[PDB]
């Protein structure tokens, strides 16, 4: 029955609803419903996600009147397209991703009312540098605890798509629920135009760096590599002429090799060879 080759197909505009609704209420645990489609037994997609209003605190979240949900889904039928729900989500800002006490109670309610109802956990205050810790989990029945739990190895791609860390396998993994794999449904006329509007330019190439601070910046770059050249003179030649060990403390905890002295030269070329050639075009182009 249950496979280990499921991949949820979230859309790009789904995940942008997830982080924006999660960053909106940070200290109060936002809470919404996830709308998608079951195309077959073990691939599920989710493209558009709406939200629900909440009244919860920073550790638990309640709900509102249920006359809002059925009136929402009725109005989404006539506009765009209709679907049936495939799960739900929340935000766990404090800790990582595991299913709490009432989180497993609402999971039992949805997998009995609906079919399978994958739940998704989002940490909004972790997705900071370049990476996100979004994950989706899924309850397993407690009766099949003498046989396999997510058994029946069909493929071998289920091992490198997820590696549960020590903070994950202590709460519910793997005796209560299990994790599921996430890929991103990327296509054309959505992804290319996503970068055709964000990291683009027209006049940025043919624009001067305004020499009031350009050559002023090069003063404080020449003087610091001047001091590194003061440091470089003694360092290598004293090390080689005293002991030829090619080793200790000048090997274990040092930082002044021939890696540090040319990267300041590397920055100083790219900042100036471009800046020299940028002032060459407009002499020809602009009369």
């Amino acid at each position: 029955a249950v496979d280990t080759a499921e991949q949820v197909y979230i859309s790009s505009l789904a995940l942008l609803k997830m982080l924006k609704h999660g960053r909106a209420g940070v200290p109060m645990e936002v809470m919404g419903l996830m709308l998608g489609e079951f195309v077959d037994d073990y691939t599920v997609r989710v493209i558009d996600v709406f939200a629900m209003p909440q009244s919860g605190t920073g550790v638990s979240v309640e709900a509102v009147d249920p006359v809002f949900q059925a009136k929402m889904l009725d109005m989404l039928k006539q506009t765009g397209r209709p679907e049936m729900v495939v799960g739900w989500y929340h935000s766990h800002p404090g800790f990582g991703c595991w299913l709490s006490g009432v989180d497993i109670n609402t999971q039992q309610s949805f997998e009995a009312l609906s079919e399978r109802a994958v739940a998704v956990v989002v940490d909004p205050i972790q997705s900071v540098k370049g990476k996100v810790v979004i994950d989706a989990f899924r309850l397993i029945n407690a009766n099949m605890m003498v046989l396999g739990h997510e058994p029946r190895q069909t493929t071998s791609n289920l091992g490198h798509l997820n590696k549960p860390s020590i903070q994950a396998l202590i709460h519910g993994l793997n005796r209560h629920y299990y994790s599921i794999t996430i890929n991103y449904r990327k296509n054309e006329l959505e992804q290319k135009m996503l970068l055709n509007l964000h990291k683009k330019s027209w006049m940025e190439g043919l624009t001067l760096q305004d020499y009031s601070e350009h050559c002023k910046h090069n003063e404080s770059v020449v003087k610091e590599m001047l001091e590194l050249a003061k440091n470089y003179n003694k360092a290598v030649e004293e090390e080689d002429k005293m002991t030829p060990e090619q080793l200790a403390i000048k090997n274990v905890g040092k930082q002044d090799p021939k890696r540090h002295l040319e990267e300041h030269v590397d920055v100083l070329m790219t900042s100036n060879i471009v800046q020299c050639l940028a002032a060459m075009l407009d002499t020809v182009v602009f009369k």
Binding site: T154, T155, G159
Partner: protein, 183 residues
């Protein structure tokens, strides 16, 4: 390593205990031991009687042996695809059948510059000759196909020069042929 002995490379016994280490350990992965239990069946495939090769006898290449191995490379995506590796199993026989039923038991020998190898014995541990006579349905390593020698003391000499394992005929020049047996 297929149908190879200790004298071919000493790393065979280093790997068989490497297989037994990672399959009799408890603190490993299912994915790690899955490659080990698969390596048990490949190394002893067919009872040391078949071999895999993308190359035929006469410089040509096999179509099903390439098909059998490239679909086997797709074992990540579907585990019953690994049954298709059996299409690349090629025999290592030298059976000298001359008539459509005549299978005489010709005792041909070999000549090895080292001592004996080639079909080791199973282990259960819980003045040497070099002219070993073999019958016609007998295995032979593909690396010792040139060091065999037809029996010059017998009149029965084959038509094609037996220099590479495959199938040949026996040019019978005597009278009163015998020794037919079929299980």
């Amino acid at each position: 390593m297929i149908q190879q002995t200790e004298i071919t490379c000493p790393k065979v016994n280093q790997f068989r205990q490497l297989y037994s280490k990672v399959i009799n350990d408890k603190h490993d992965d299912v994915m790690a031991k899955f490659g080990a239990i698969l390596a048990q069946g490949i190394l002893d495939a067919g009872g040391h009687n078949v071999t895999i090769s993308l190359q035929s006898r006469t410089g040509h290449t096999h179509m099903p042996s390439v098909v059998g191995v490239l679909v086997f490379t797709q074992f990540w995506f579907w585990f019953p695809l690994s049954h298709f590796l059996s299409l690349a199993y090629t025999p290592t026989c030298v059976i000298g059948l001359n008539k459509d039923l005549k299978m005489p038991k010709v005792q041909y020998k070999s000549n090895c510059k080292p001592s004996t190898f080639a079909y080791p014995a199973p282990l259960e541990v819980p003045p040497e000759p070099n002219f070993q006579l073999l019958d016609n349905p007998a295995r032979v390593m593909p690396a010792q196909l040139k060091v065999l020698t037809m029996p010059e003391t017998c009149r029965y000499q084959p038509f094609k020069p037996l220099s590479i394992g495959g199938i040949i005929i026996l040019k019978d020049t005597s009278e009163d042929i015998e020794e037919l047996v079929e299980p």
